[model samples]
Target: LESHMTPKDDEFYQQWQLKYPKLILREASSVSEELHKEVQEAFLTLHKHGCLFRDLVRIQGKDLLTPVSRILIGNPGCTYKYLNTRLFTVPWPVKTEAEIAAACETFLKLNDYLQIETIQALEELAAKEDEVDIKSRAAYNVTLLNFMDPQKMPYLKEEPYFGMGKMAVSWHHDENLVDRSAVAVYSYSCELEGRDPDIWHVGFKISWDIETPGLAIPLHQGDCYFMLDDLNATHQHCVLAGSQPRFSSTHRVAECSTGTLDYILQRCQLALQNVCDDVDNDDVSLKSFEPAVLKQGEEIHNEVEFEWLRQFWFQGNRYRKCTDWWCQPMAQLEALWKKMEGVTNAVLHEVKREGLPVEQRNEILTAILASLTARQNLRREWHARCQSRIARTLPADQKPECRPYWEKDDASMPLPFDLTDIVSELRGQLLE
Candidate 1:
């Protein structure tokens, strides 16, 4: 192929060919049939204990209005972002604690083997793992049970699938996933079926986040995906095109010592204690969150900021105006959350006649999650960038201490943390 290519493409193919494959596909069943069945039964059993919900994957950096059916399980207060959707951890199902543990233990052990083996020829399959002992020495706190249900709703648009999801796993580096994680699908019950106006699934297509080339790998029901340090840090993976409905549990782990694990669990425990649970389990009131207390410089008036954060969930008709490129995002993200609680303002006006249903409130809670991903990507990047520079440029002894800083408003309740804490808290209070 390179024989007829430009020098650049030729050079890239050599590099690509040398890379064997972008994703690792190993010789393994989703898992031992028996072990797989046990895991599947546990999944159903765990559901009876609650903590399972159909979470939307969100439209994008805007369109906070819609998402898809999804499930997340992790250490106490886990939170993740899918574009504009800011989903918080609603405490993993503890009622069937042992079943979850069994699932983790069974597959994590299998993941170890895949990471160390090489069933492919060298030029095509060199060692993809790093020097770190990820296979043996890592721990997990999050498990995302992502499902691609092909069941189209009564209404559909912009690609036929109902709701605001377009991809099974959108392509990009591991944005909000754990650093070192292994995902094993719950075999029997899960399958990516591509329902083309009838039936289908999303194929697993992954590539280096940057450039070069990508490879399409077949989906395995219970195969475990093991990621070394920066595997996702430097790579973006996804199921862009599918031919069926796909179901899988992405089990994620952090590279932490037991001490760090203890810290996270304890913090989650405290958050849970104060966590007001009702309609939305994800909502943890701002009062309970314990981010470092607000300092002097991190203050802004309450109206604009709080409404701004919680406001996106209410700003409907996101793309009703303007042309394609610039319109939607600006309409949805660039908020008008001035002088009032966003949803309350929006919901109250609509409800001037009669109260809404449980569905409408749930919609608002999902909107509140927008607070997590709203206009904050750049802000956090700036924060990450600034601190990274500080970490690198600042000298060891000359370092200055810092806590999370945010624009505060008078109405913004004084939560020890920032807006996330406040809104997450408000979501809880609002839902309850």
Candidate 2:
């Protein structure tokens, strides 16, 4: 097989036509010249700046490399979760208010162009085929750019027999997106000549069975398509290798049953409260800030630097007007919580070494007990709420009997100290 395969020569085109009868494909000429140019420029601008990153996806318990690099941009509260990863809108870093406003304008334009078609497709699919609005629902709140460089594709030198070509993405269902929502993909070629427009193909298969023949569909520059109805739920798809470099902007409406802004914000405030309690504990007496902790805090601060994000699908102009207010406070809160946790841990070490009066020890124990109890209860309550919310989206007969395995095995679970054992240990230390 060669690096490039055309629709005429490709064997899977017939199968694709038969199987994907509802697949919506709008040709390059379907869009206006100005709109096509505008979308292409938007992709180029995002690529030129360092917005895209090769973020790892956690498979099983390990973090694995992704074939394409991407960065998510979406409505303020719309977060995308997949393979144990939660992605939020982290906008590109700008020096001044003007630069920030400019970035917002870029996304606003994109949303105007993309959402009209996306929403209309979703609505039409629902009215014709599915019971979406009554059960689960979605709004156009998620967008991400996937950039693939042929030279950078991992294991390209290895056997192409297994993957059919240099793989941009392996076969998998669009996990974590709401049911009945549609995914819109717009493709662009980064090369100057753009000769190999049809080199890349999206291969679709009914299941993971190796023996089953698949369908491959070519997506050219300025082409846009949608996977509507139960297509994502019933079938799996992958990006087969393209000869030339290309990028795609994929937009989907993600389910926020668990990773809501309110949920994350509550967790943040709880952590801060725990730190404040530690600082105010009667036994805790550290006269000055320790240098080691301060240095480590600085390193943590430097870890997250400013980067650009191409915003899209925001509900209102609030994102543009209050960019700093939306972005800065959460960052500061995260940093403060970590730094404070470090300080408290250091203070604990000191307190352990130097014996304390019974009065102070008792005060510390009470504070620790209260904090731990609150933390565990919060986890249980939140998980319960999430499970219950998910159940509402399904038919009564199909509702899960137990909390789903994925919800139970949270990455954030497993506390450092067992609630029962920690109490005993703290009592032993204080009693002596």
Candidate 3:
């Protein structure tokens, strides 16, 4: 009977052992002690068996199966109910402690750098803009967790990192700060040439740099800037005007752009083409575009450029944003191109520093050239899609809106008073 005792029976026996004083002193002391020892020994044996089973499963590359089972066992209520209610639902089996431990290790190793890398990427992207600077020691924070290990890290139901997503845009007005420009802007654009027009929206917050400026600017949301007909070139615009400008300063601006119903189906396809090209080519070089400058006495350098590739979904008139799920599929291709670039560069640098055997040198150069060719092909394909989308969305009449009027030889548009020169001079002074 003792050997056959189930967990429930053991639990009842333990409870009875606690409840009866006479039994505790007499039969319970000896009998219950023996049972307790037996139960603990059984548990130990079960644990060892579980570890061995997990090892076998891992050897077969059935790692996911073990974690799934562990999740089910840990949350038996959720598992049993889900299995009972859903006819086609797959049942999660019980997982051993070893399986759970292994799952946790795997999860941590893969995700440990995710939060740090994500934050670093955001910082790098933001640094491209000379005007906007993210605030440090502010409310911003990042958290990483293993869903399978709730005890290690709790599940977050709200936005992590003080509510900043993949990007944050801000405005500031301090002369002493590095990115101290009066107004900061964050914007993103998509093309809908061969696809249906997408309705999308972006949201952001604004604050002032002086004396705890209360509610200076409220949160704003609007449709995503999309090119309608012109496929070659289209301009998306936003303003970052401040009420009154003083010294140059930078603030925080956070923006999220998502696709709407029609946009998701059509615009996503176009965007995907662009993303693929970008990934394939590994074209990480900066464009030749110049930064905006401030006038001598003028307090504001009001505009900044903000661009990124976003993955989102659309629902009804509103757009529902998806997380990084959509970006994973392209990871393999992107990673390959990135690795090729790194390896080629490393080999070339080594060759330049120290001469190598003729054959080995030729092999390295050949590899570099091959990588370059592959990257170029990827870039051309991506650019072709971008150009096509731009041409399709932008009409001939809208050409003026896409580029500066000067580029089109339009004499009617007024030119600012050599603002570019003033900015260049200021940049020199700042560097000095």
Candidate 4:
């Protein structure tokens, strides 16, 4: 129900005025055509450059384990940590290759465009009321972008969980934001084939009370909007998917905390330790490397245990081939890989030097190799699953070309093999 039920010509605006007073919506026609095209091009550039990724889902959580495609960009040294993942926030630097650098530039330019416009909108809203105070808020250090293509991702066409149709993002409030900060959003539709029948809405409900009506604001291509003051804290919002592929870049002034990389590093050490323990324990087998049985506090360990390998094997390997791309923790990764190498050499050295029985020695060697192969295989399988999901968003013409790095010989390094042969060759050399 509306507060006092004030009547208006546009029901959409009327609802916003009555229910979501903090929301400001701009129709596509009201925005500059150039800005619209610029933001749309930014999406394609980032997509082509591989700046977008699907984050890992927790094994057992309130959220579904399915991967959802998205892009995250922000100021340097910052992170938008959410969904049990750490997305580094940085504008692409000039030192990178031309195309990748362009992707970074695209992000900065888009940020500037939205930043200025959002402030102006805020001032205008403030002007309406006399004796108001406004401060220059922190720059939007984090941007979370979503790409939704109903045809590619059929699950997006229906929110079976919520019983809400065409739900791209389920209901949730923004997290890790400064107090009273404004959250701005810019929308772009990839409707080259044809326009969507439903122009998708960002639904907002202030309360779960049955008597309280919700607000729906449909954002077309090139349209932008922002939520100010207590709106985000006071209401829950979601993106209802449309017929065509679409993109929305939502910017926020996020709290700057720098422990994400440290957290990942700690997890990396534990994963290595966990694997070592499994290899030493007689009871553990190849199945030990699989998803572990976990309790309440063990969720983070489960994610980090697998994700450490995923990052080390997949993203870490691919980063070497494609240095142009941002997001990989290259330097930290170098040290971790070396540590594993040293550990492996030490294990083999002890096994041979101690004159262990040949059968027992072979078993030890096999266990170590098994963990390496198993983790890499798991990472590859997950990568393929994500690729298949993303490819559905593309037109038929592009599906054939959507290949993961592992499929391309130049893009991926070789997996290790033939430890017996290599070890024997080393022994033969020693005898000579």
TM-scores vs. true structure, each candidate: 0.43, 0.60, 0.18, 0.59
**Per-residue accuracy of model 4 over 1-432 as CA lDDT, tens digit each:** 132111222464557666676787777787677766666777887677665655443334232333346766666545565665455544544335666556657767777777777777777767767223233442676688777566767355443333335677777888777777788888887551121336666767764543554555566677788888778888888787777778788888876643345655665565455344434322221212222311111233224434443433332223322242334564554445444443444454544655666665555544454454443455445555445554345444223121223342432222232235545543453444
Off by over 4 Å in 3: 1-324, 327-340, 389-432
Please say which candidate is ahead in lDDT: 2 or 4.
Answer: 4
Model 3 lDDT tens row, 159-246 = 1212211111122221111121111211112121111112111111222212211111111211111111110011111122212110
Error (Å) of candidate 4 at residue 106 is 1.9
TM-score of 2: 0.60
Write down the worst ten-residue block by lDDT for model 1.
Answer: 289-298
lDDT of 2 by residue, 264-312 (tens): 4454444333233454333333443333433333232222211111111
User: Local error of candidate 2 at 325, Å?
Assistant: 7.1
Give the winner by lDDT.
4
lDDT (Cα, tens digit) per residue for candidate 1, span 301-357: 122232223222222222111112223332322232221123233332332325656
* lDDT agreement with native, every candidate: 0.37, 0.53, 0.23, 0.55
Worst window of 10 by summed lDDT in candidate 2: 305-314
Better of 1 and 3 by TM-score: 1
What's the residue-level lDDT of 355 in candidate 1?
62
Give candidate 2 misplaced runs (Cα > 4 Å). 1-6, 9-14, 91-104, 122-138, 157-163, 191-198, 266-327, 335-432
Weakest 10 consecutive residues, lDDT, candidate 3?
A: 297-306
